[PDB]
Amino acid sequence: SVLTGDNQQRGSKLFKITIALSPTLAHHPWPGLDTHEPSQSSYSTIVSLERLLPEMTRIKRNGGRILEITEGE
Amino acid sequence: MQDAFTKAIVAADLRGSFLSEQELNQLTNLVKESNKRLDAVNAITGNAAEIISDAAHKLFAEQTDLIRPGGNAYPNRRMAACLRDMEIILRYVSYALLAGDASVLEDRCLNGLKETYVALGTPTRSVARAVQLMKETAIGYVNSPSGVTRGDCSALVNEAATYFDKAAASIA
Amino acid sequence: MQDAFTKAIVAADLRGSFLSEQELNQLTNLVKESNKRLDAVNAITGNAAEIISDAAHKLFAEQTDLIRPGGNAYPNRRMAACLRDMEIILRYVSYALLAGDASVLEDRCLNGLKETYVALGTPTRSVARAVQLMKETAIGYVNSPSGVTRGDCSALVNEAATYFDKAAASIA
Amino acid sequence: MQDAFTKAIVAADLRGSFLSEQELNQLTNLVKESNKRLDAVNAITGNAAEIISDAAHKLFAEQTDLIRPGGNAYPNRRMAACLRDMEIILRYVSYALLAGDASVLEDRCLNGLKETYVALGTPTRSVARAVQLMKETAIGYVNSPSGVTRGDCSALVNEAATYFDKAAASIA
Amino acid sequence: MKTVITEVIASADSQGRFLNNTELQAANGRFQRATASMEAARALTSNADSLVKGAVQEVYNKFPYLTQPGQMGYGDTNQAKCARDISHYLRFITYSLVAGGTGPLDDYIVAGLREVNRTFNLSPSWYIEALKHIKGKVGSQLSGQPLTEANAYIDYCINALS
Amino acid sequence: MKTVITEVIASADSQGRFLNNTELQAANGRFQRATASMEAARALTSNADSLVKGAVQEVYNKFPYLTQPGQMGYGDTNQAKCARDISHYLRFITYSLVAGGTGPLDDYIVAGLREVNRTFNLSPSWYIEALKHIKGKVGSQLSGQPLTEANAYIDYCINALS
Amino acid sequence: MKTVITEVIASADSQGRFLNNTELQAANGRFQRATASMEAARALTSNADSLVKGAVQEVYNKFPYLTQPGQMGYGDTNQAKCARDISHYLRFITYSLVAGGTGPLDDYIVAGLREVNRTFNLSPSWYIEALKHIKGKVGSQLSGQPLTEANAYIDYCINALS
Amino acid sequence: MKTVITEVIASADSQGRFLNNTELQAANGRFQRATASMEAARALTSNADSLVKGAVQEVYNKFPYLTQPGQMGYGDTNQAKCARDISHYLRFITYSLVAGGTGPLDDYIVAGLREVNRTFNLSPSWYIEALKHIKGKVGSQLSGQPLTEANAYIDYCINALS
Amino acid sequence: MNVLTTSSQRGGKLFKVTMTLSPALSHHPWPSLDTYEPSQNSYSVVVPLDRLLAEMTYIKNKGGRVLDISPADLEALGPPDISSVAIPLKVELWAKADVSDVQAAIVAAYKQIFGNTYVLESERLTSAESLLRNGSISVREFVRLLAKSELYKERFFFCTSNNRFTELNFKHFLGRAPYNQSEIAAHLDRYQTFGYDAEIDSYIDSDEYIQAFGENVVPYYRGFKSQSGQTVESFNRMFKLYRGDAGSDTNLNLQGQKRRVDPKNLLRSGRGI
Ligand SMILES: *[C@H](C)[C@H]1/C(=C/c2[nH]c(/C=C3N=C(/C=C4\NC(=O)C(CC)=C4C)C(C)=C\3CCC(=O)O)c(CCC(=O)O)c2C)NC(=O)[C@@H]1C
Ligand SMILES: *[C@H](C)[C@H]1/C(=C/c2[nH]c(/C=C3N=C(/C=C4\NC(=O)C(CC)=C4C)C(C)=C\3CCC(=O)O)c(CCC(=O)O)c2C)NC(=O)[C@@H]1C
Ligand SMILES: *[C@H](C)[C@H]1/C(=C/c2[nH]c(/C=C3N=C(/C=C4\NC(=O)C(CC)=C4C)C(C)=C\3CCC(=O)O)c(CCC(=O)O)c2C)NC(=O)[C@@H]1C
Ligand SMILES: *[C@H](C)[C@H]1/C(=C/c2[nH]c(/C=C3N=C(/C=C4\NC(=O)C(CC)=C4C)C(C)=C\3CCC(=O)O)c(CCC(=O)O)c2C)NC(=O)[C@@H]1C
Ligand SMILES: *[C@H](C)[C@H]1/C(=C/c2[nH]c(/C=C3N=C(/C=C4\NC(=O)C(CC)=C4C)C(C)=C\3CCC(=O)O)c(CCC(=O)O)c2C)NC(=O)[C@@H]1C
Ligand SMILES: *[C@H](C)[C@H]1/C(=C/c2[nH]c(/C=C3N=C(/C=C4\NC(=O)C(CC)=C4C)C(C)=C\3CCC(=O)O)c(CCC(=O)O)c2C)NC(=O)[C@@H]1C
Ligand SMILES: *[C@H](C)[C@H]1/C(=C/c2[nH]c(/C=C3N=C(/C=C4\NC(=O)C(CC)=C4C)C(C)=C\3CCC(=O)O)c(CCC(=O)O)c2C)NC(=O)[C@@H]1C
Ligand SMILES: *[C@H](C)[C@H]1/C(=C/c2[nH]c(/C=C3N=C(/C=C4\NC(=O)C(CC)=C4C)C(C)=C\3CCC(=O)O)c(CCC(=O)O)c2C)NC(=O)[C@@H]1C
Ligand SMILES: *[C@H](C)[C@H]1/C(=C/c2[nH]c(/C=C3N=C(/C=C4\NC(=O)C(CC)=C4C)C(C)=C\3CCC(=O)O)c(CCC(=O)O)c2C)NC(=O)[C@@H]1C
Ligand SMILES: *[C@H](C)[C@H]1/C(=C/c2[nH]c(/C=C3N=C(/C=C4\NC(=O)C(CC)=C4C)C(C)=C\3CCC(=O)O)c(CCC(=O)O)c2C)NC(=O)[C@@H]1C
Ligand SMILES: *[C@H](C)[C@H]1/C(=C/c2[nH]c(/C=C3N=C(/C=C4\NC(=O)C(CC)=C4C)C(C)=C\3CCC(=O)O)c(CCC(=O)O)c2C)NC(=O)[C@@H]1C
């Protein structure tokens, strides 16, 4: 997701993170086995350095792995 | 408590005004029906015992478990209560019918009845059922008397219904 | 949620029975009126804005103090709320009218409403008043429309009333 | 109950100790003021009726709606209550003033007051207002009496204020 | 609120008993009376204003000094109030006629009457005159039972005031 | 004894107040009704006997076994009592019509009814039939309001018995 | 807690009336006395300790057997307690002088005195001696009204104990 | 009758306890004050008459219309009564000073005040002026505590009247 | 407790009064020191309006003290209907959402995140809304922004206690109510060192959030239906936290922000700390 402007209000250096998505990370609210969205198997988000460690750890424990990290600017 | 007349007053009071002529005409006509109204009440009271007796029989024929050990109408002690309650509800309904207003029934009897029943483990549904059974029987009398001047009581009959139903609903 | 049909079902279910033929005939009839029913709703929705606007004007002409400093409709922020509330109540009422059942109105809107108003210090009396003011205006439209096939809507009109009144009562 | 003396005791008790000489000197001087203290009280009690009467007039001149149909001070019955209440609060305040301690006031009088007012739909704001109106009038007398030895009562005057204010706050 | 109908209900309710013939007889009494009562109310409601003017006025004739400066009758605010008040009395009376009991009167007017009047230094006397003057006027527009009813209620207040 | 008149007095008395319009309205009701009530009583009083015979009789038809030896209906003493009793019921009813309230019924008949009946093993059922049979006959000699009144009271007992 | 001031408030409060002259007179009494009372307290507070030693001691002289092994007076723990206790009595007395009422005494010492003493087999007698011995000593350090006050309170306990 | 002394007895008596130091303190207060109180009474008692004349008079100045024919202030009987009445008020006040409590006032004057006044249409207002006028005069003959006392009691009535 | 009649036989609005009982107020007819029945430490009475003044004065003149007064009509009302929260409904914001769908989400989010509480035109956040619907922000991220926003702080966090704010938070961010005293304690400590932002972050970051409505689903009410690792009492606490439809979390009302869940009730579910 290309940042239109600095997403976060609170300010630090921001880094774009592209992740391969497990069904768990974004389960659809559907009956049966939850499916992540087809259109994005690789969600990309913008994160502040402070949040970067929590975001990565949560991504890690869920199936999906970091495809790439890029500084948001 | 409250009734049709008093009510209209109170409304008028908050507006701070004399009664509207329109409003008088509600009361004027209400008076005219009195005689019918009265007979209706008289019919219930006259048949009271029966109404209940009847309803009960039917209630227990339907929900046989209530009267089996472990049910809520067993043993005698409980049964007695259940009968007593039915009656009360009836009494209040009649009162309302005379007043020409739900209030008396709701404030004295219905407000909190559900919760009581719940706490005890009385099945509210069955209670409601009973109330209806009563309703039908009661109307039966109201609507089919002998030696009264023949005429149309529908208006009253329906209002009666409503009262019964408010009861059924709030209990249920 | 619930409406006229579903309701009758549910009742029937607890008895454990197929729907009584008598009961079908309630619903059968209800269907026939549909068209009328619909137009009624359509009339409210079409006039919505106005209904409110109107009622408000009258509300504030009566209870001048609400709009005076220290009153409950002052300042702007509060006024705004008061308007929106009126509207909401209306919205629900309409919904009910279509459903053919109070429920939706009771559950979403009326339930807890009194207490809220109390906690805020909103004067429940005035709220109720507003609701009535609305009622009358609304009926006005329901009952006097344009380009509609002429016939009798009374039945619907009264049911409408009742809804408004349930509201008035439970708020008050 | 409690008052200035008793209080100091109690504190001392929990420490488990005889009263500190320092602490005695609080009480010693407190005694010395007695006479002033008394006159203060005497002034209120002597003027009681008036204090209230006065405050009321002013209260109703400000908040006209209280006395209009639909308001909280209407009708007579309600008005009466409102007056009665004012007085009570006053009575307590005086008591405190003599004791030299808020407690009595808080425990007998203020405790639960807000909630009552709320439940009734009495507008707490207005109540508070009344209390202040009273305060000012009362001080008026405390501070301008007849036949009293001229001297400084400020200390007492302020304490009086505080009591009134605790009241205002907890009600509001 | 005390009306015939409410009372019998109440009495029945206390004993825990159905409304039997006893009570209905009573009810029948009310509602029979209503026709007259209602008539009276229509008459008062219509002439309200005029009755009020006349009364207020009267009071001043009866107690000239009230209109002097530094008195209660003096300055418009007070006059306005004076009017308002009497209106009320009247209003309630009509109510009571229609309700068929003193109820409305008792709860609005009578309960707390004394203390209010004491604290604001309203002299009962005044009100009374107002009423009397009224009674006299009403004694023209009405007749027979309608009249009788009107009186009863008017008086009821006189007695409460005094 | 509970009649309309006594009650309003009582209520007035409890509150500690003079009889005001409220109560008189009620009283008036009682008095206007009386004319019908009184009529009914004259009618019952006259046909008393015949009503009684008919009733007693009925009961036996309804419950044949009572007349068999070793039963309660059997042997004249019992029959005499049975007659006596019903007479009483009737007597009281008349009273109540005239008094304009259930009072007389309540105090003579109803209070203690159950226990008496229990201890002597009188079956309510019987009495009831008696009454019903009566009601049916009365439903010829009377008409309109007079009738209505008669019924009310007769029933009142049925309900008390049951 | 019962002091002069609290009581008059209470009495006023019960009847539902403002503090009038009656009560203030009373209050005034409390305040005038205070000067003497306060003096007494300063005197006891200062000599506390010495009074306590003396008392404890006395008790043992009076009841030699207490100090024998297997008795209550025997072994330091008990002696410590004995000291503590008397300290308390004293402490409270001072309090009461200052508070200008028995209040403090009543609530700490007196209420429940008996049962405590019963369950732990403390003999009232002992305490009493303690007090008496005290009273005697106090009867030197003080004089006139100050003295009188001291006594009153000391006694108050004697009577409660006995 | 409520005086300091009676009250403490009462309170003591209710609880079922002996008079302890608490109460005596209170009593002492009453006795110390007495000297001032007594003085005040001697002063009022002496000037009684003159105070009364002045008051009665005042009232008429304040409410001229009273002296007109057909009013209450008119015709000697009434004037005599008016005098008498005020005398009473005064008399009692003195009593209360001496008794050291409102008691005398409460029982003679205050209890039943309202209803008496209502039934005979005596306007509280009048009395009040009387008192006020008095208070003003007394405010010359007396001084210091004696004065203070006099006021207290005089006021006490003002408040009761209003 | 339940009250069975709203009004006395003589017309009169009954009012339930709750007091802490005192030995003087009621005592056993037993020898020895008077004791109130332990079960009635908090006694409740329903009194008509007329006797209310006398009743309350007497209570207070003894050592009683009034816990709360409440009109009998509000009392003896049905427990709120759970109809709308039994099955929440749920909103998914697809990618390539058309204009309307984005609007619906926004509305729904404001509803759940703020309670019934109304958000005015000026209060509403254009910027945050802007981001959603040209991508860039997840529904999850929007939700974070709302809880960061001052609007949120002013209503929930700046008026009430942190104790109250926690459960207030729980309900908005997770349908659940709080289970156990520990959760309340943990959040409080987080807030003291990390501050307000970190605490807000810890609910959205939590796996319970992720497991249900993890991304691009507007939060819904999980409580009122059976959840894993949820204390049974939590379900009852959900009835206290959630009062009816058209009942809100409002700073605005008198003494607006108080605790729906008593501290003791939390202790029952679990203790340890
Ligand atoms: C009968 C149709 C059903 C039924 C009834 C039932 N009720 C109870 C217990 C009580 N009922 C009430 C309710 C009232 N008392 C009143 O004063 C009023 C008017 C305000 C009502 C309507 C009360 C007070 C009780 C509890 C105490 C009592 O027994 O009086 C029972 C007994 C329950 C028990 O545990 O003993 C029963 C059986 N339940 C059924 O089975 C029927 C479907
Ligand atoms: C309606 C449910 C059924 C019905 C009623 C009915 N009643 C009347 C007329 C009267 N009924 C009464 C009855 C009373 N008046 C009283 O004062 C009392 C209490 C003491 C009663 C019970 C009276 C007196 C009248 C007036 C004339 C008469 O002789 O009955 C009518 C006729 C219409 C009217 O209002 O007059 C009717 C229709 N009968 C029916 O047809 C319904 C089934
Ligand atoms: C009643 C409040 C007033 C009134 C209404 C009325 N309407 C009809 C008949 C119809 N009205 C509609 C309208 C709709 N049907 C729909 O499906 C929708 C929503 C898409 C609407 C708005 C229709 C289609 C009919 C039937 C065709 C026709 O118009 O004739 C009637 C006639 C009764 C009947 O249809 O059985 C009436 C009375 N007219 C009044 O006079 C009332 C003030
Ligand atoms: C007067 C300034 C305002 C006012 C007062 C008002 N109060 C009531 C009713 C009550 N007020 C109280 C007061 C107290 N309860 C206590 O515990 C204490 C302290 C010890 C007090 C002072 C109570 C108990 C009641 C309810 C019972 C009663 O009859 O008093 C009313 C009447 C409410 C009603 O609906 O009847 C009023 C009007 N309200 C105003 O309008 C003023 C702003
Ligand atoms: C303070 C608000 C005003 C004020 C007070 C003031 N009073 C005194 C002195 C006394 N006041 C009293 C009054 C009483 N003593 C009692 O025992 C009773 C109850 C029966 C009362 C009402 C007394 C006895 C005294 C002592 C003698 C005297 O009057 O002088 C003073 C003087 C200083 C002092 O503390 O004694 C003062 C200042 N005077 C003001 O200026 C204020 C307006
Ligand atoms: C008319 C004869 C005299 C007069 C009257 C007057 N009244 C007031 C003030 C009040 N009047 C009432 C009376 C009522 N208010 C009610 O709610 C009811 C029951 C429905 C009544 C009968 C009240 C309560 C007040 C108090 C304050 C208020 O206005 O509400 C005044 C003002 C006196 C003052 O200073 O407060 C007056 C003057 N006016 C005249 O000129 C006549 C002498
Ligand atoms: C008639 C339907 C049946 C019948 C009746 C019968 N009754 C008794 C005995 C008593 N019956 C009554 C009734 C009343 N006595 C009163 O004082 C009143 C109130 C005014 C009533 C209603 C009473 C009290 C008695 C008991 C005392 C007595 O001896 O009368 C009997 C005799 C029972 C016995 O055990 O001897 C009988 C048989 N007889 C029939 O044939 C019918 C079956
Ligand atoms: C001294 C004259 C004798 C003595 C006394 C002694 N006391 C205890 C134990 C207790 N003493 C008290 C007394 C008080 N505790 C209080 O809280 C108060 C109110 C301020 C008093 C007056 C109490 C309650 C105890 C019981 C337990 C406790 O720990 O206090 C003992 C110990 C006896 C025992 O059974 O434990 C003794 C011996 N000691 C002497 O040497 C004298 C004979
Ligand atoms: C004086 C300000 C006005 C006045 C007074 C006046 N009073 C009466 C009649 C009574 N006055 C009282 C008062 C008291 N009697 C007592 O026993 C006591 C307590 C010791 C008091 C305060 C009473 C009881 C009466 C009524 C019975 C009686 O005759 O004494 C009148 C006569 C009024 C009448 O007869 O209706 C008058 C005129 N007179 C004036 O000039 C002033 C206006
Ligand atoms: C003693 C081992 C511990 C202790 C006890 C203690 N209890 C209280 C006060 C109360 N205790 C009770 C207990 C009961 N009341 C009952 O009716 C029953 C049986 C049915 C019990 C068990 C109650 C109700 C009270 C409070 C009111 C009363 O006095 O009856 C206290 C005093 C508390 C106070 O401040 O009043 C104490 C000390 N506490 C200890 O210190 C011991 C560990
Ligand atoms: C207008 C007729 C009267 C009025 C209303 C008023 N309401 C509020 C505040 C709120 N009212 C509600 C209402 C509802 N919540 C719902 O969800 C529904 C049904 C779904 C309704 C109808 C709510 C939630 C609130 C609280 C939230 C908020 O206030 O933002 C106020 C404002 C209170 C304040 O002090 O700010 C007002 C003024 N009050 C009047 O003056 C009229 C009599």
Residue numbers in the entry:
A (entry chain A): 1 to 73
B (entry chain O), C (entry chain F), D (entry chain U): 1 to 172
E (entry chain N), F (entry chain R), G (entry chain T), H (entry chain P): 1 to 162
I (entry chain M): 1 to 273
What does the paper say about this structure?
Cyanobacteria and red algae use extramembranous antenna megacomplexes called phycobilisomes (PBSs), composed of phycobiliproteins (PBPs), to harvest light. A typical PBS contains an allophycocyanin (AP) core—two, three, or five cylinders of (αβ)3 trimers of AP—and a set of radiating rods—stacks of hexamers formed by αβ protomers of phycocyanin (PC) and, in red algae and some cyanobacteria, phycoerythrin (PE). Here, we reconstructed a cryo–electron microscopy structure of the >10-megadalton Gloeobacter violaceus PBS, with diverging, conformationally mobile bundles of rods composed of stacked phycoerythrin and phycocyanin hexamers, stemming from a pentacylindrical allophycocyanin core belted by auxiliary phycocyanin hexamers. The bundle-shaped morphology is maintained by linker proteins, including the multidomain linkers Glr1262 and Glr2806, which are unique to Gloeobacter.
The reconstructed cryo-EM structure revealed three pairs of C2 symmetry–related rods stemming from the top of the pentacylindrical AP core (R1/R1′, R2/R2′, and R3/R3′). Unexpectedly, the rods formed two bundles (R1-R2-R3 and R1′-R2′-R3′) that radiated at ~15° angle so that the first-level PE (αβ)6 hexamers in rods R2/R2′ became ~145 Å apart. Although two PC (αβ)6 hexamer stacks could be confidently built in each rod, the density of the third PC hexamer and PE (αβ)6 hexamers only permitted approximate placement. We located the conserved rod linkers, CpcC1 and CpcC2 (22), which contain pfam01383 and pfam00427 domains that connect two neighboring PC layers. The density helped unequivocally localize Glr1262 on the first level of PC hexamers in the rods, consistent with its predicted position. The three REP domains (pfam00427) of Glr1262 were identified at vertices of an equilateral triangle, which corresponded to the cavities of three PC hexamers that formed the base of a rod bundle. (C) Topology of the two copies of Glr1262 on top of the core showing relative positions of the repeat domains REP1, REP2, and REP3 that attach bases of the rods R1/R1′, R2/R2′, and R3/R3′, respectively, by clustering them as two rod bundles. # indicates the C terminus of the Glr1262 chain. Two copies of Glr1262, each with three REP domains, are necessary and sufficient to cluster the six rods symmetrically into two triangular rod bundles. In the absence of a CpcG homolog in the genome, a rod-core linker found in studied cyanobacteria, Glr1262 apparently plays this role in Gloeobacter. The bundles of rods position multiple PCB chromophores within 35 Å of each other, which is sufficient for interrod EET.
